[PDB]
Design a protein around this ligand. Structure first.
Ligand SMILES: O=C(O)CCCc1ccccc1
Length: 571
């Protein structure tokens, strides 16, 4: 509009405005205290209200990137707390905003969020409800600087709903802790899922993201025509382009417009949207993003009639390559909800390479006649992977499957730091607990598309301080071949065994007071250090060392030896 901050304030309302601005500052300035961010948000909100009253007021005609960029450099502790980040304010937009994105720390070096007792949180929630929810938006945004901002507003609504219901219950802990544990897990998954959308945009461009969007939406909305799916992909690409670039006010506004358009044209998109569209606005967008795949229309013609057996295959492809390739991806994705997105991208990439060399010959039809037969090896390749990994997971359980994959990937890339290897390998085991129960119909889009997210975690956490060129090679190769690049890696022989440090294998009584999950990570951290020292150690001897450590921990926690049990286990 005329005043951009007034257009977003009037579309989103003050509540969502204040919350999104808070996320914005917390994602860029991740080290500043909570009190300093509230003043900026309130100063932005007071300034925004003056523009709603008069759009032609002072400073109201500036762009959102300019207004947000200027207020960022007003903090006196910018260069003393963030270092060289202040040097980037000497640039105009958008050259200034692009640097601020580079300084977002994916591992921001922040203490773990200790959760107070249930009676303490409930008293604080009743004292100041607005401040209590602001600290939740603040603490999550810092540790997740790319978190899907409109989706974070929804998590805050459920976080508020969990306390409103449970703090009046007779047994508050039995009510609240299950909801909080589920909210944290679903929030970590949402963070990692969105971190791949931004990496795909910031490292491979919109074309690679629109192809991903076309595939998944065609599996999800098979009844919709191509022009309808393309319209949704165009609107969805602009949303995540803004969210990943920090334009959180435009992202949540455009997402609400997109959610509203789908519901007013559901009969042209999908039949699974009747219930999702009867929810409040913030819940409406979340429901649509997780709706089931609609039933594809019955009696569909084969792709060979329009893409292999036609006198205008090369004619329509030459007239518009990406449009013709986008129709092939759409027609194939809608018919195959059992394929993963990344697989459909490989089949489209293969179909593209064939049309580039065959359409230049004199007999194109005889050249690309058997193009679909080249897809058989690509389809069976991830099925052998999932089948072998799920059989290994069903015979060990999640924890032993995590350790099995923890030793496997430590031997592949031993240079990666231990905290990064532990988190990634633990998440590589959670995909087994989530997908290996589905039948072979819905198992591939579950497993392989979640491996895309987890391996992206390895890429971003290694992108900061690279220590291994093997991860860099698989991360910057072609995005869609990331998993095959890692699944084909062998044990790194050029890695020299690390030095021996006894302080790493020394513990205290603090390990007994930790939770069972925190104890597993404490032990798995010691397992990664064991594999680095002896890369050629057999898996059975690695079990003999882990069986002694798993027994030594239980021995010292039961026996009240005043942690002298841990000190005596020195050698
Ligand atoms: O083999 C690898 O490289 C990692 C396999 C990870 C995986 C887990 C569960 C299902 C499928 C795959």
């Amino acid at each position: 509009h005329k005043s951009e901050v007034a257009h977003r304030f009037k579309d989103l309302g003050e509540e969502n405005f204040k919350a999104l601005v808070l996320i914005a500052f917390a994602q860029y300035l991740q080290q500043c205290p909570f009190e300093d961010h509230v003043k900026l948000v309130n100063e932005v909100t007071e300034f925004a209200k003056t523009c709603v009253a008069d759009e032609s007021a002072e400073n109201c005609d500036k762009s959102l990137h300019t207004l947000f960029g200027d207020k960022l450099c007003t903090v006196a502790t910018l260069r003393e707390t963030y270092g060289e980040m202040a040097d980037c304010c000497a640039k105009q937009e958008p050259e200034r905003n692009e640097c601020f994105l580079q300084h977002k720390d994916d591992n921001p070096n922040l203490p773990r969020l200790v959760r107070p007792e249930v009676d303490v949180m409930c008293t604080a929630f009743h004292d100041n409800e607005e401040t209590f929810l602001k600290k939740y938006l603040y603490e999550i945004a810092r540790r997740h600087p790319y978190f899907y901002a409109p989706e974070l507003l929804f998590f805050a609504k459920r976080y508020k709903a969990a306390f409103t219901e449970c703090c009046q219950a007779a047994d508050k802990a039995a009510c609240l802790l299950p909801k909080l544990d589920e909210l944290r897990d679903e929030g970590k998954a949402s963070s990692a899922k969105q971190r791949l959308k931004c990496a795909s945009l910031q490292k491979f461009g919109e074309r690679a993201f629109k192809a991903w969007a076309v595939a998944r939406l065609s599996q999800r909305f098979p009844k919709a025509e191509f022009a309808e799916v393309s319209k949704l992909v165009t609107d969805l690409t602009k949303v995540h382009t803004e969210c990943c670039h920090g334009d959180l006010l435009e992202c949540a506004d455009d997402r609400a417009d997109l959610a509203k358009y789908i519901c007013e044209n559901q009969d042209s998109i999908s039949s699974k949207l009747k219930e999702c569209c009867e929810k409040p606005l913030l819940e409406k967008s979340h429901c649509i993003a997780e709706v089931e795949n609609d039933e594809m229309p019955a009696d569909l013609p084969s792709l060979a009639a329009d893409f292999v057996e036609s006198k205008d295959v090369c004619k329509n492809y030459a007239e518009a390559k990406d449009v013709f390739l986008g129709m092939f991806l759409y027609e194939y994705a809608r018919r195959h909800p059992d394929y993963s997105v990344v697989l459909l991208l490989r089949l489209a990439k293969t179909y593209e390479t064939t049309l580039e060399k065959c359409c230049a010959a004199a007999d194109p039809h005889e050249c690309y006649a058997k193009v679909f037969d080249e897809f058989k090896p690509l389809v069976e390749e991830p099925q052998n992977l999932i089948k072998q990994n799920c059989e290994l997971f069903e015979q060990l359980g999640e924890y032993k499957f995590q350790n099995a994959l923890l030793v496997r990937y430590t031997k592949k890339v031993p240079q990666v730091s231990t905290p990064t290897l532990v988190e990634v390998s633990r998440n590589l085991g959670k995909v087994g607990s989530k997908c290996c129960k589905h039948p072979e119909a819905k198992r591939m889009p579950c497993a392989e598309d979640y491996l895309s997210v987890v391996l992206n975690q390895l890429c971003v956490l290694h992108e900061k301080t690279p220590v291994s060129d093997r991860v860099t090679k698989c991360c910057t190769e072609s995005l869609v071949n990331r998993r095959p690049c890692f699944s084909a890696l062998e044990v790194d022989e050029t890695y020299v065994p690390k030095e021996f440090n006894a302080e790493t294998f020394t513990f205290h009584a603090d390990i007994c007071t930790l939770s069972e999950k925190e104890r597993q990570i404490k032990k798995q951290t010691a397992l990664v250090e064991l594999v680095k020292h002896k890369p050629k150690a057999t898996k059975e001897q690695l079990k003999a060392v882990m069986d002694d450590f798993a027994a030594f921990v239980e021995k010292c926690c039961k026996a009240d030896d005043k942690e002298t049990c841990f000190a005596e286990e020195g050698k």
